[PDB]
């Protein structure tokens, strides 16, 4: 459940998340009917004074049954084209991603485990 | 003599007939699959069909952490953490996509629920993947495990420290000082434990369902 | 039928200068087989990507579902998912910056993947 | 140096808590301000 | 530096075999990368480091050559 | 067997190779210092001649070869 203001954790080998910075990157806008966002829902993410593209991974948000639930509300940078930012993802990533509606492949590409 | 907690019913206006009609349902899987009895505190491994690739298992070991539901729909939940990001599942035992459930390590632990294990220290919650089973004895009892774990800074996700709880797995010492422990006994309710109305007998009900579990194997 | 066979003799009609082919152990649950396919303009990426689809659709039948083209918005790298095989098709550049054929071949030795460490810090200092 | 100017940082009582984000979740980690415990020594040094 | 001089060049050896029997990807263009791994790493390393480095290739060619198909 | 057959078809494989540039391509060329091969570089040589003339040749002698000559009386005497 990410809102507008949320703070989130950005999982991935980009230098612009991996590089330190005195605030931590916030959520600007959720592409959704409603508001909140779950896995697999697009934000508008502000960091280090800039706008970006990025994808929502995992929450700790109980769901349903059978599914994994995170310590930390985990997100991915993504290029306006689409493409993935960085280039490697270590921490593990849910398989639920791989039929929900939207386009997934590329993420799923990059990340070496699956929870 | 172990009955498994789905058994037991919860007191209420429902009628008995619902419980002997789910009762049956609840044998008949375990023929086909067999439970291994366990608590919280035991380390898990879990085997089920992926339902979104094509006839490809998964596994996840843990440990069990909370075990809820009656009936048909009973649940436990077991926690691990991977590559330092941790992850917890909650499994439906007659879910009928289970293929396997093994018992790694059968143990006890002071309480009966140990979701503070979430603001206890990183260490207290991972497990190797891949550890093998460890033996057991059938002429004894199962063990206590006495660990009384460590705290991160005091915000915390719950507040642990409060009566309510009844936390027993604490080192509060280290982590509070004796005049926090007099500010939380201010929520302490005493009366509770001596109000003769609030407690539920269940004796001779497991003793019953115990025969005519029996009596149908 | 639309097997490994087929796909990889429809690309080598449809000209894919570059063609990596990877087996994938069941211990991933992802995929059977994992195929990266090298294009030369983006013009040649979309005909590349269409006769494909158009081909699926002829050939299979029953209970068989459709599948999504994706990357369109994308102008240099585009992916198919079909049941059980995946296909990357990308210009030169892109698919040596990803590297994806080491990440997959080296499934848990790649050096980028070594490059990235982990984080403890017991105060801000 | 660190430790001591910990403490001065501590005895002089400029701190700040700041919030990080951690895959086992946030934690509330304190910084203590090395520049203030750093002026605060050197007064003393000066001072008899 | 390495844990043989002999098995880096075994090593490659067995790699350009393998390379002669894949069937279904260019041949040419897995020789090719190959030479490129075997050119850029080995030519500056250290004795860790290129445990480290040969350790890996071994694992590759022990593994169906990494999968390649 | 030819012997100047063999020495051509060696010449011939060796000239196919490119990264050595033919300046001395004589039957006695060295490969260490008048062609600048490294250990890498006499591997691919040794299959460049195994691609179509050898193919049971070992490595233990092989990096001994060292000229066109030598291969040529190596393959010769065992075949
Ligand atoms: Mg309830
Ligand atoms: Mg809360």
């Known amino acids: 459940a990410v809102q507008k203001m949320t703070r989130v954790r950005v999982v991935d080998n980009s230098a612009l998340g991996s590089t330190p910075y005195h605030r931590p990157p916030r959520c600007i806008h959720v592409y959704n009917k409603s508001g909140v966002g779950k896995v697999g829902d697009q934000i508008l993410l502000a960091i280090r004074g800039q706008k970006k593209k990025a994808l929502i991974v995992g929450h700790r948000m109980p769901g349903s049954r059978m599914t994994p639930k995170f310590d930390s509300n985990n997100v991915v940078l993504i290029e306006d084209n689409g493409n993935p930012v960085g280039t490697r993802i270590k921490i593990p990533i849910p398989t639920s991603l791989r039929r929900r509606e939207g386009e997934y492949s590329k993420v799923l590409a990059i990340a070496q485990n699956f929870v | 003599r172990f009955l498994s907690p789905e058994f037991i019913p919860p007191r209420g206006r429902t009628n008995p007939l619902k419980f002997k009609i789910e009762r049956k349902d609840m044998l008949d899987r375990r023929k086909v699959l067999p439970i291994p009895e366990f608590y919280v505190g035991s380390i898990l491994r879990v085997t089920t069909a992926d339902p979104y690739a094509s006839g490809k298992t998964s596994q996840f070991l843990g440990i069990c952490i909370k075990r809820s539901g009656n009936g048909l729909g009973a649940t436990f939940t077991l926690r691990n953490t991977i590559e330092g990001q941790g992850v917890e599942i909650c499994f439906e035992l007659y879910n009928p996509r289970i293929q396997e459930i093994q018992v790694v390590k059968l143990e006890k632990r002071l309480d009966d629920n140990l979701l503070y294990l979430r603001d206890a220290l990183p260490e207290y919650s991972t497990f190797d993947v891949n550890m093998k089973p460890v033996p057991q004895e059938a002429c004894q009892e199962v063990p206590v495990n006495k660990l009384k774990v460590k705290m991160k800074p005091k915000p915390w996700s719950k507040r642990w420290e409060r009566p309510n709880f009844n936390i027993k797995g604490i080192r509060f010492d280290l982590a509070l000082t004796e005049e926090q422990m007099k500010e939380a006994q201010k929520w302490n309710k005493p009366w509770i434990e001596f109000d003769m109305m609030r407690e539920y007998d269940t004796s001779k009900i497991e003793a019953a369902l115990w025969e005519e579990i029996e009596a149908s194997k | 039928?639309?097997?490994?066979?087929?796909?990889?003799?429809?690309?080598?009609?449809?000209?894919?200068?570059?063609?990596?082919?990877?087996?994938?152990?069941?211990?991933?649950?992802?995929?059977?087989?994992?195929?990266?396919?090298?294009?030369?303009?983006?013009?040649?990426?979309?005909?590349?990507?269409?006769?494909?689809?158009?081909?699926?659709?002829?050939?299979?039948?029953?209970?068989?579902?459709?599948?999504?083209?994706?990357?369109?918005?994308?102008?240099?790298?585009?992916?198919?998912?079909?049941?059980?095989?995946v296909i990357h098709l990308m210009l030169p550049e892109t698919r040596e910056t990803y590297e994806l054929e080491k990440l997959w071949t080296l499934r848990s030795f790649d050096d980028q993947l070594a490059q990235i460490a982990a984080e403890t810090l017991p105060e801000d200092f | 140096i660190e430790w001591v100017l910990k403490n001065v940082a501590i005895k002089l009582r400029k701190t700040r808590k700041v919030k990080v984000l951690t895959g086992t979740g946030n934690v509330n980690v304190i910084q203590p301000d090395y520049a203030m415990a750093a002026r605060d020594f050197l007064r003393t040094f000066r001072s008899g | 530096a390495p844990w043989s001089r002999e098995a880096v060049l075994c090593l490659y050896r067995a790699l350009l075999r393998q390379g002669r029997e894949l069937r279904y990807t260019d041949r040419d263009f897995y020789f090719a990368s190959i030479r490129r791994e075997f050119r850029k790493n080995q030519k500056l390393e250290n004795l860790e480091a290129r445990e480290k480095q040969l350790e890996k290739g071994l694992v590759f060619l022990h593994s169906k050559l990494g999968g390649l198909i | 067997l030819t012997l100047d057959g063999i020495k051509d078809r060696v010449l011939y494989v060796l000239k196919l190779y490119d990264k050595i540039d033919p300046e001395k391509l004589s039957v006695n060329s060295h490969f260490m210092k008048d062609l600048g091969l490294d250990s890498l570089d006499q591997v691919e040589i040794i299959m460049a001649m195994e691609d179509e003339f050898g193919f049971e040749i070992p490595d233990i002698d092989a990096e001994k070869l060292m000229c066109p000559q030598e291969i040529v009386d190596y393959i010769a005497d065992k075949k």
């Not at chain 3, 200068?17 to 069941?26: K, W």
């Not at chain 3, 083209?69 to 102008?75: M, V």
Request: with cysteine; aromatic share 10%.
């Open chain 3, 1 to 85: 039928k639309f097997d490994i066979d087929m796909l990889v003799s429809l690309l080598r009609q449809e000209n894919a200068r570059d063609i990596c082919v990877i087996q994938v152990p069941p211990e991933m649950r992802y995929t059977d087989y994992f195929v990266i396919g090298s294009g030369t303009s983006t013009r040649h990426l979309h005909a590349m990507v269409h006769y494909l689809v158009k081909m699926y659709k002829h050939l299979k039948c029953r209970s068989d579902p459709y599948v999504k083209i994706e990357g369109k918005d994308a102008d240099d790298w585009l992916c198919v998912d079909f049941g059980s095989m």
